[PDB]
């Protein structure tokens, strides 16, 4: 029943789905790391992309949970649809 | 060429808080010092293997490693080149590079850790 947009996920989904990106450190994963990493830049559309994974803002925790903050926080306040509620 | 055995050689430079910063400008950054002496007479299997260490010596070093994200640091305790910024990227390069500096002239000078160079895929032509 597969997700296509940000819209599908509840935030502890796309949470659990950034820290996959996190954990795909291996050189033997480089290619599903990218496309993770791509499938992240086309489901959030914020204009930071990658950036937001590897070169944070000082000012949030430097984390999955503060990158899930970030683009909640930013998908609201330029009225885009947002995360999938409670379940 | 890359793919063939051989051993590390040379010194590297100083460097200190911002030569990550360095590598994403002209000519990019040394391998730093303290790094080179960690892999100096070191046998390598081929530059891929001198790559993969390399990184995870920048790892083990705090002052190199605290100047990567959460995420890039997890990277270069794999051995895994870490993800460039954004403005850095060129179309399919996503990582940092390394890049020899002068023509190869003699046997093992793929590893002489004189003339490689830590840049950004936006750095690597030159």
Redo the contacts between chains.
């Keep these: 029943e597969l997700k296509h947009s940000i819209s599908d996920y509840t935030e502890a989904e796309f949470l659990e789905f950034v820290k996959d990106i996190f954990r795909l450190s291996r050189p033997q994963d480089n290619d599903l790391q990218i496309k993770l990493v791509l499938e992240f830049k086309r489901l959030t559309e914020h204009p930071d992309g990658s950036d937001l994974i590897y070169y944070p803002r000082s000012d949030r925790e430097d984390s999955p949970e503060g990158i899930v903050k970030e683009i909640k926080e930013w998908r609201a306040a330029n009225g885009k649809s947002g995360f999938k509620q409670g379940l | 060429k890359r793919n063939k055995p051989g051993k590390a050689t040379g010194k590297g430079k100083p460097v200190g808080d911002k030569w990550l910063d360095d590598a994403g400008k002209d000519s990019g950054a040394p391998i730093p010092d303290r790094i080179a002496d960690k892999l100096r007479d070191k046998e390598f299997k081929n530059f891929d293997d001198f790559r993969?260490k390399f990184w995870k010596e920048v790892a083990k070093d705090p002052d190199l490693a605290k100047q990567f994200?959460?995420?890039?640091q997890?990277?270069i305790?794999?051995?895994?080149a870490?993800?460039?910024?954004?403005s850095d990227?060129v179309g399919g390069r996503?990582t940092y590079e390394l890049h020899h500096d002068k023509p190869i002239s003699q046997d093992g000078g793929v590893y002489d850790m004189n003339n490689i160079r830590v840049t950004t895929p936006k750095r690597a032509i030159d």
């Design positions: 993969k994200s959460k995420a890039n997890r990277n305790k794999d051995g895994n870490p993800f460039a910024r954004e990227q996503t």
